[PDB]
């Protein structure tokens, strides 16, 4: 099972969303919570004492209910499952450590990251800032089939390690759209702002959807070929904030369970845009407000990575992209975490 870690991961997902949505309202948002969670859980293998438990608590783990071993083995199983072959669904998740050519890293840390997160180890010269940025960014770009470019946008000269992970997702719709029916249509951004978008249309299929009687929204769940689904949640005009206030793991499960009853499987005329959005986040600036003050402070104990220098957190980035069209969805993301001395 990776079911033991599912509650914490979902809690983190919705906490992160809520912070972004409330701090930058009226803006496109897109991220991979799984990528962030897995990056930071991997990092925690190198943290000691209070710093280790605080990273896991920030990620939503209840360390009275779960052992550290339950968390890490949960991720190992989660990542293994995602990486297994599928017919009309590609999911790949991977990790890497870019290690200073000079420094002696603790074998336990390196061994644990390889055993649990299947981390690939690369050696690089962090004095060569330009070359190291290119090496890391090219690796992420390649692993994301070109979607995540320039993940690491800054790198200090005193960095000795950069942790990265990535997720790549490409999945066909069970119920695809016929591209000859896609035509430009109006999209009402707000009361005064209207843009044109290619609008896909299907009207012959049954779909899983509801008009919520407790909340001002409708919810569509579309299945992919393979073990994935997407919820498209459509607040009534002007009611986005009201839905965001209640967007929790419990609400997602409510909607999911309502959409397991065949009375919510009905013929639907569905207009859905063909579109792309992306997100780009500076996690070292955001995560202190989601429980990670210790990690980003002068007090962080990262002495599980090396005994050779006193280490501290440097920059941490997250970028993600979403591409929706008539055949399916492509989504990619990556997370970096740099450590300096």
């Amino acid at each position: 099972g990776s079911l033991k870690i599912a509650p914490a991961n979902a809690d983190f997902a919705f906490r992160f969303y809520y912070l972004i949505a409330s701090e930058t309202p009226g803006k496109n948002i897109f991220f991979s919570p799984l990528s962030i969670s897995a990056a930071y859980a991997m990092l925690s293998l190198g943290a000691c004492s209070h710093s280790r438990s605080q990273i896991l608590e920030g990620l939503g783990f209840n360390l009275t209910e779960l052992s550290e071993s339950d968390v890490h083995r949960g991720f190992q199983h989660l990542l293994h499952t995602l990486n297994l072959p599928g017919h009309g669904l590609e999911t790949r998740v991977g990790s890497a450590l870019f290690l200073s050519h000079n420094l002696k890293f603790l074998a336990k840390f390196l061994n644990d990251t390889m055993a649990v997160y299947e981390a690939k180890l690369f050696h690089t010269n962090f004095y060569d800032t330009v070359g190291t940025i290119q090496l890391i960014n090219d690796h992420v770009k390649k692993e994301t089939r070109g979607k995540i470019v320039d993940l690491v946008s800054e790198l200090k000269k005193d960095v000795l390690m950069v942790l990265v992970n990535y997720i790549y997702f490409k999945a066909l719709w069970e119920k695809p759209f016929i591209s000859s029916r896609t035509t430009p249509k109006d999209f009402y951004v707000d009361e005064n702002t209207t843009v044109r978008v290619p609008m896909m249309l299907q009207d012959q299929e049954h779909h899983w959807y509801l008009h919520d009687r407790y909340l001002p929204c409708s919810v569509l769940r579309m299945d992919y070929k393979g073990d994935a689904t997407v919820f498209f949640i459509l607040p009534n005009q002007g009611k986005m904030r009201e839905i965001e206030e209640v967007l929790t793991p419990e609400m997602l499960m409510r909607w999911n369970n309502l959409l397991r009853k065949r009375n919510f499987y009905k013929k639907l005329e569905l207009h859905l845009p063909k579109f792309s959005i992306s997100g780009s986040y500076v996690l070292d600036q955001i995560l202190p407000r989601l429980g990670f003050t210790d990690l980003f402070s002068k007090w962080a104990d990262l002495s599980g990575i090396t005994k050779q220098q006193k280490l501290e957190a440097s920059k941490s980035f997250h970028k993600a992209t979403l591409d929706v069209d008539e055949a399916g969805t492509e989504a990619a993301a990556a997370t970096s975490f740099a450590i300096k001395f």
Partner: protein, 35 residues
């Protein structure tokens, strides 16, 4: 018109792994003509 959905105003997106019960991606489309 209860059998129609038009995603022609801001909406939320939750991509979910049903084998691992993980939220893989989460987001909001406010203006889809920003890449």
């Amino acid at each position: 018109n209860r059998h129609i959905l038009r995603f022609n105003r801001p909406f939320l997106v939750v991509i979910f792994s049903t084998s691992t019960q993980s939220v893989l991606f989460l987001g909001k489309v406010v203006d889809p003509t920003k890449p």
